[PDB]
């Protein structure tokens, strides 16, 4: 809510959550919303760009009786993933060192 | 480097600098550049927003044979301080709760 989520850590978030089991974009909108105030507008240009980008390929599946297209982490995108969370590893230690007191410049 | 930090994150980060102890701009700057990449012309006004807004005071001190400007963390600004790590700790887990499976809509 308070801090915004930028759309790199969007990807993070997709990439994150298409890993876990393959899913239509609704589904991961409404776990995004959950932190994010992204419209789906701005989600879905995203989810396109991973897919261009090789990470996530995507098929249909009837789901409730309407097609959905369905987001899959392509191994590219479990490499990618990897690298994305460690960034994030990275990014969270270096704000808590920072804020902890233990990173300085210098 | 990797993810971006938005000003909302870098006014955490300065008031969390600052409540270590008082300092001046360049080396708030300094420690943020460590994890930002954000402009004097950026870095400035948020401390100058900060201030007006109760969180830093400010005064000047001789440091090296130069007058610096410092900023102090206000009791107002340590109050707000807690509620940015809270809200930090928060996003933090939010993230990490999505990305690792247990956080999903419904």
């Given at each position: 809510?308070?801090?915004?989520?930028?759309?790199?850590?969007?990807?993070?978030?997709?990439?994150?959550?298409?890993?876990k089991?393959?899913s239509?974009?609704?589904?991961?909108?409404?776990?995004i919303?959950l932190?994010?105030?992204?419209?789906?507008?701005t989600?879905?240009?995203?989810?396109?760009?991973?897919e261009?980008?090789g990470?996530?390929?995507?098929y249909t599946?009837?789901?409730?009786?309407r097609?959905?297209?369905?987001?899959?982490?392509t191994?590219?995108?479990e490499?990618?993933?990897?690298?994305?969370?460690?960034?994030?590893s990275?990014?969270?230690?270096?704000?808590?060192?920072?804020?902890?007191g233990r990173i300085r410049?210098?």
């Open positions: 809510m308070y801090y915004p989520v930028s759309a790199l850590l969007i990807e993070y978030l997709i990439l994150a959550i298409v890993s089991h393959d239509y974009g609704y589904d991961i909108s409404q776990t919303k932190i994010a105030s992204i419209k789906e507008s989600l879905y240009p995203i989810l396109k760009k991973l261009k980008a990470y996530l390929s995507t599946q009837e789901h409730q009786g097609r959905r297209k369905y987001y899959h982490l191994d590219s995108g490499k990618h993933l990897v690298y994305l969370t460690k960034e994030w990275v990014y969270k230690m270096t704000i808590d060192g920072i804020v902890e410049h210098d």
